[PDB]
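Schema walkthrough. Field components (list of strings):
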Amino acid sequence: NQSLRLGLSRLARVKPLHPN
Amino acid sequence: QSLRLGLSRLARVKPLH
Amino acid sequence: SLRLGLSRLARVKPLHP
Amino acid sequence: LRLGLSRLARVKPLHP
Amino acid sequence: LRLGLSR
Amino acid sequence: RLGLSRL
Amino acid sequence: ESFGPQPISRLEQCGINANDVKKLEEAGFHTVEAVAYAPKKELINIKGISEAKADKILAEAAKLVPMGFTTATEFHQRRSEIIQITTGSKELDKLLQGGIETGSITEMFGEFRTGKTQICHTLAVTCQLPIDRGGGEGKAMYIDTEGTFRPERLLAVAERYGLSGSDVLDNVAYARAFNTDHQTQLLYQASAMMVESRYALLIVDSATALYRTDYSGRGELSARQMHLARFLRMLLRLADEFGVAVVITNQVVAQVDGFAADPKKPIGGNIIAHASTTRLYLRKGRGETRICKIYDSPCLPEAEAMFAINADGVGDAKD
Amino acid sequence: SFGPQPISRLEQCGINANDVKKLEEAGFHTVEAVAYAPKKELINIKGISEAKADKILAEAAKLVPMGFTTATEFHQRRSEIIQITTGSKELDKLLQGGIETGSITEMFGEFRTGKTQICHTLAVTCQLPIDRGGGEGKAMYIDTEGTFRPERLLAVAERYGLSGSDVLDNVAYARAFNTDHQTQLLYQASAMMVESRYALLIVDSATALYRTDYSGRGELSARQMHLARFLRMLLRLADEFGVAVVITNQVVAQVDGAAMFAADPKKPIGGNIIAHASTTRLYLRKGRGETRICKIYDSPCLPEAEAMFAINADGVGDAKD
Amino acid sequence: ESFGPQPISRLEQCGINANDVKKLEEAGFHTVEAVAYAPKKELINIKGISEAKADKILAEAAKLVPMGFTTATEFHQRRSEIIQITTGSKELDKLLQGGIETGSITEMFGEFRTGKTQICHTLAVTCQLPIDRGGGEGKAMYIDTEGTFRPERLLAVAERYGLSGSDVLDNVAYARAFNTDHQTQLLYQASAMMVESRYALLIVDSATALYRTDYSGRGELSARQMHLARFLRMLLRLADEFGVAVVITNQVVAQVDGAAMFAADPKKPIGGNIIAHASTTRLYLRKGRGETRICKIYDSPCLPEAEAMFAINADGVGDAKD
Amino acid sequence: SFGPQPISRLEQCGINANDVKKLEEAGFHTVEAVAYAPKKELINIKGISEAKADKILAEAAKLVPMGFTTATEFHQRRSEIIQITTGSKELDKLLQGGIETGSITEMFGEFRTGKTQICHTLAVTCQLPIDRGGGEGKAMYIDTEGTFRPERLLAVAERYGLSGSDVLDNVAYARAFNTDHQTQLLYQASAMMVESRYALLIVDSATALYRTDYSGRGELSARQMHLARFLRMLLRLADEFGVAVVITNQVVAQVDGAAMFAADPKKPIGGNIIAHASTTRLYLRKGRGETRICKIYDSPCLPEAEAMFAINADGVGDAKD
Amino acid sequence: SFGPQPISRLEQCGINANDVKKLEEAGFHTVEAVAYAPKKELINIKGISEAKADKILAEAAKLVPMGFTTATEFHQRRSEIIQITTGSKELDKLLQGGIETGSITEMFGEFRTGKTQICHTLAVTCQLPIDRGGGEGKAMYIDTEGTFRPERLLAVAERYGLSGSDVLDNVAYARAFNTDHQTQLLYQASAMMVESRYALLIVDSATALYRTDYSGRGELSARQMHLARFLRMLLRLADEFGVAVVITNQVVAQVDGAADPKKPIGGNIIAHASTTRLYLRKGRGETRICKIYDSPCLPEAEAMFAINADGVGDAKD
Amino acid sequence: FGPQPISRLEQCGINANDVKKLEEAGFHTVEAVAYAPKKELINIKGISEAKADKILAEAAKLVPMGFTTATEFHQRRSEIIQITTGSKELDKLLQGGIETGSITEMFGEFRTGKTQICHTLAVTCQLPIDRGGGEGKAMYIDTEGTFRPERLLAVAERYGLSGSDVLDNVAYARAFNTDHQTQLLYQASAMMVESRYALLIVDSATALYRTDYSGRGELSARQMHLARFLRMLLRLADEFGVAVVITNQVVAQVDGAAMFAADPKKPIGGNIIAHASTTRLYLRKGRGETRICKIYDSPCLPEAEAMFAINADGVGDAKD
DNA sequence: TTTTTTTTTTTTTTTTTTTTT
Ligand SMILES: [Ca+2]
Ligand SMILES: [Ca+2]
Ligand SMILES: [Ca+2]
Ligand SMILES: [Ca+2]
Ligand SMILES: [Ca+2]
Ligand SMILES: [Ca+2]
Ligand SMILES: [Ca+2]
Ligand SMILES: [K+]
Ligand SMILES: [K+]
Ligand SMILES: [K+]
Ligand SMILES: [K+]
Ligand SMILES: [K+]
Ligand SMILES: [K+]
Ligand SMILES: [K+]
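Field assembly_structure (string):
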């Protein structure tokens, strides 16, 4: 559920857009 | 007895105060 | 008795002891 | 898209 | 006949 | 026309 | 001459006993013109009539009242001598071609504050004017249902026309009705009392107000209408028994469906539409001016007039 | 015998006590109420037959006057009518004495214009003696918005030199939650007027709860009939107990472009029913600062004119220079 | 004592079957006051309820709730002990003679940056204070239609008043409205949570923000006004039911007519006559200089028109620093 | 599961596929979009009745919570929001972290103040890793004046040590030529953002076209209504996708007043609609040389303060000696 | 195909074929023109139904691209843009190539600074070969002061080695007596520009007549509105044919004693409308100094040029 | 070649009362109506929106208000008359003399000889075309009251012209305030529509503006009135094709920033008159009776200096 | 073949030099 979300929580595991 | 169109001005009632 | 709002004299448990 | 006159475009010589 | 008030 | 003509 | 109503008592000369005359008087028949203009159904409805005396009294009233055909020339001669009550405004009088006709039903409707009560007061006080100034030389009647009767307007108009206030308030009878049954009973009392003296006007303001709240809903509409019809017919009977001018006022309702610039319709329906002879529509203009229009009339063409309500009553525009 | 006669007098005319009790339970507490009631409403209560209702109405009409009457008597009786001062000299001059009993006076206008203030001032001034311009009686307040403040009454009472406790004890207050509750409060009021003398009835607001109770064009018809019945009952009370009824109102904006030429693009709600039912109409508008303007909108005996009053810490009064 | 409203379960002992009680609870009548204050038409609208059943329910509700006449002295005595919530500023407290009143409707309007949200946050924090310190001794509810709820201000005011920030945050409920329908539907849930726990404040910020864009054009004006009137009536019902203090926020619109003449403040609140008549107390907020603003009582039945000055300090709305 | 739920989630809930396609064609591409929309919008579109709209709304609400949460939970959730660095340490301290996500930030000022430079710097910096001040996402640029210049983007990317090629690749650009096209750009952007992760949407400028499109006071109402609808669409997009919406504004000079505001009277255009709609407002002013001053005009959680930044050859930064 | 597509294409996929002529009468001579126009403008035209306008807009939208695009394609397109040499090396270096096409450049300064001289030099140099820095097209000159001297054009053409007769033949000239005539000339230019290939449009000056046509503060508001509309029309041309729009502006001294005491006229409308701004100041003798008053990508700097007998060029030390 | 009278528009399909109203308003010529916008015609009471609309839409047909190539403009301007100033050096530096159809404005301190130049031009204007004149009458609008009908006789005697016809060919009008100046311009147009004129002297243009308007409060009103007057002059120059010549005074730079040279003398009127004036001349005192004229602003003429003198016969070449 | 009214809204546009001991 992760309850409500508002601002792209910083603990999200996102792949690096710029790897280097 | 006669037509009355509201409280009579000349009617004598005990004052509230 | 009628009620108009929250009563000052009413006994209410405090929320911050 | 076009933002104006393009250098890489064939044009008949206006002042030959 | 009667048609109304007479002048 | 711009002004008085010389001709 | 033989223009005034003929009293019922002369039926005694036609072999009719006093008991039957008293019974008909108790019922509400006070003139031979009334019983003659009445079929045998209500005569047999009365207790004490067994189809034997009814036929002979009806025959006597038939021979005592002209009922056969006549040429249009006599009708034209009688119509040319009719009495019209002046409304106090030259433009309104020109619109009505003389004033309010006697022996016919005139009905006025419009929004609030348009001035129906003011015009009713003006007519009730000007019906007593001399015949050469446009009056009718008679008394006035005011059957009021909304309780908006004010003698002050009568006094003001009387001062305008140069009369006596005490002498003009003596010649106007008033009665208040609280429901429809009281209204019909007041009509009966008016018919009973109207033979003693000479009358010229009869005002009902407003004719259909108590019907709005007395009969509410779709389940009780029809009976309501029927009751109204009866009332209207009684009015017409008066207009034939004494030739008086009947003025009845009406309210308005708003049409909610789909157009024109007049989203107002008179309450009462087709029954009151057909029953009334002349109809007037009152609209608010600018300031103290109002517009009168002829809605329905058998002779008068449709036209518009402007009249003001000054401190002295209904009058022309203050140019 | 100026006051209305109790319905118990019908027992002396040949009516059994249980029939009188049933009539009272139906909402009738006065012989005049029985007399003014139609036959159909008499039939519609259990325990009364056609002959019974006819006899009751016969004796009721026996005990009350319903015949014709010369206009001189009407003028003489109307000259003895009672009026209640509004509070401002200019308003009294405009109204030719002030509020008149036995009729219906409606006040409408924008927000904050002073309808509730005028109602409070009337409710406190109605207890003044006849010489000072009061009504010499109690008053009732029906509040459909939760906007009843006794502090205003106390302030105006202190302005007029009366007693605060007495002026508070002589005013009845009732809050209506819905239209049916309004009608039930009207029934309770009709029961109450017969035992103690009153001289003013205040409704604020008469048509405040009709806006939301009936919503849309589907329920306009039932809303209009309910409002008509309410106004008819107010008229019945005014004719019975001779009290001045004053109802407030709310306005709406005339969105049609034709009203742009007009200088007042605001019209009272309630429509033709309340327009015809009300006798006198007052239009209230805001002036400058704490002063307002009252205009006659429709009256059978008052010409078109405007006044200039104000609202001060002591209630409704004249505009201080 | 018996100050709190009687729960709907009281109808069980009064002869009402549990099925009808459950139906009423589903319909939203969670309290005896709610059913007692509703007309017969609303109860009839509920499916599965007959005319006789509705009549019996209304009669039984009227038995337990007084609905008759009472003297003005009793009402004055009852209003004497009412609870008024402090706004945090002495000047604004003196202007309103105590603060925001319970059981009524207070609406504040003005242009941007005036400080309506700041006052709402300060009231939400202070409503939990003890009665002797200007509070209302109850929780707070925040219905938000703009996404401008900041717990940092709540923590700052709690730090200022000496309260614990964690408890202050724990004692405030928050909900967000995405459209007018959700805004109206939130009040049923509000009543559901307010039945079991005592609440002193209820904040709508802002009431009319969504109506500007939800209903666009003159042709949709009537439906918008009807919906707004229904929402305001529901708010009044809640206020009269639970005795909470309802505070709503309003916007402004400029008067292009140009008839203001010398009046250099051509701003009028939006909403129209519906919100003008429905609202009991109205405040007009204007900007002064720096961080100070001026509040004026636009509309009130017992408070004269005046002006007060208040500053939005780092601890919330308060007295200006001279 | 942190991202928005795709509309295909409604298929497993028993919703007809044809109605899902119709909703997708109507502009609703997520379950959150359906949940946040009133029944009126679903009724308006062709092919959907009242019952089916009610069913769709119920199923959508059953997936995303719409109830009451404790303030501690909201504080905990807001403690983990993403704030994008603007490129200047002083401006970052003024904004207490940078541009906030999920809210509308509007910067207005004179010409040459530096709104476009700030927009370009933000667009480049939105692609930085999370633990460097960035947001780790793409950017959008809706341009209504033809002032987009990739050279500034390349310069800022060079300054921050990134590569120019992928920095230019991860920015979407569109140009609007009137108000209606400006509106439908948001409709396209909704799908473009449900397809891939985006962090920041720029509108520069929102009000420029409205002045010329709607002229005079005759068409003021329609212009304001259209602006309100556009701002509502922007707010819905920001709420649903959780992106940072940055818009720019223009200013006008007040012919009246003057003495009231002695700081060179210049008020932002757009009126109360854009005044209320925006969450944060930044007033930009020119100082000396290339240095400019940013002031917090309006913010719900930021004190009113001023800061100074500069526009150097590598973008927006802190002014040097 | 690179240039604008004439509206005659609209009757190829389907159209009434009679409303096209009527749109031409309205002022739209290109599919780009009608596509860029809002629905309100099409509705305003008497005799066009809402359905007809919607159909026309839908048909025009499917031709011109109006969607989203990656920034790298925008960079590629911008790298191919053309620029016109001013006439001096220093000004070209300051402008990083010259006058950009498709944007608006405004030049302001006091009297004798050389706005008209630069305008004449640009109107001559815009006909140069692209490899030599020209725009390869004709020029248009709207003059609102009666200050157009063909002798300067002849001198600059002789300096550049062209032929004076052809240079004169390849420059269109118009004179406006009031603002309404200015807008009518703009409409006529929009109609004319679809036939021949143009590269530069000069307004000299844009705000001369606005100072006197509208009098006092009471008529200020409407005046500004008119100016705005005018500028918008210019932008439309830059969005349609790709020409470079150059306008000249006057100056007003600041009387309030605050803070050079000269500011451009026209206010925020022309400040925001213009994309590039050049402030011109008098130097020593025949030299003048140009400053980048506002630019979206050019850093603020200064350059020096001169007005020699062959037009605007580099100063001689 | 001359302006078409307003009566030419009478048969064009409009009422004569409208023509009379236009004439009494100030529009004595068809292109005077054509050059006016809709606002001026609407401001005329008695003319409706439709009336002005049709008037303008039909008057635009006779006069050319469209695009033309630069070659046609050059050919047309190649036949523009230039009036000689009586000095060979001044003619050489002006490249022909004072141009016709534009605004020429000389300024300088006292004794420079602006009034002498004006008188010489007024006399010379009546000369034949081959003799450097314009072959037309001239007028003199004087605001300083320094018009001497004795220098005119001397200059006429220099050129072999009789005094009587030269004197009666020159119209004179004196103005005492700016409103009188505007009414004098209106009357000048009224007399121009029925005759032939070639030169209009308004010495001095802004001499009364220093005194009539004082202080910083009235600076805007003074500047805008000057702009309106200059616009009226420019409209007259377009409509009738006459040469307008005005005269300015100077003020001293007290700012102290003029240390780069020694000449604190700038013309009054500011940016409005700087932009409005097409050609500007600066006059400086030399030695004895000789003066120096320098070009200040000119779209085509370069910046050069010439030396002239004021002899008993008027403005001429300095004697070595 | 009768019946019943209703609901406000939206800001805008700059200007103009001066005067030597
Ligand atoms: Ca009446
Ligand atoms: Ca018939
Ligand atoms: Ca009130
Ligand atoms: Ca807020
Ligand atoms: Ca920009
Ligand atoms: Ca120039
Ligand atoms: Ca002189
Ligand atoms: K009829
Ligand atoms: K009435
Ligand atoms: K209120
Ligand atoms: K805001
Ligand atoms: K700019
Ligand atoms: K001298
Ligand atoms: K110039």
